Amino acid sequence: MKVRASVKKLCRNCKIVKRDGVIRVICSAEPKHKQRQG
Template identity: 65%
Template structure:
């Protein structure tokens, strides 16, 4: 889930990651 506009969703090898400038916004989903 995107938390803010700067969050980027990256999918690779079945994993979904959220990368953002704000460390609190980082998420990982298997």
């Protein structure tokens, strides 16, 4: 995953989550879009 400080939605299937305080993104399609932090 990418740990950039400005996570954001890159496609339709991507979704924003807050696990253990940290803001993450998760996708159905592309595993590339999976990112953390920010």
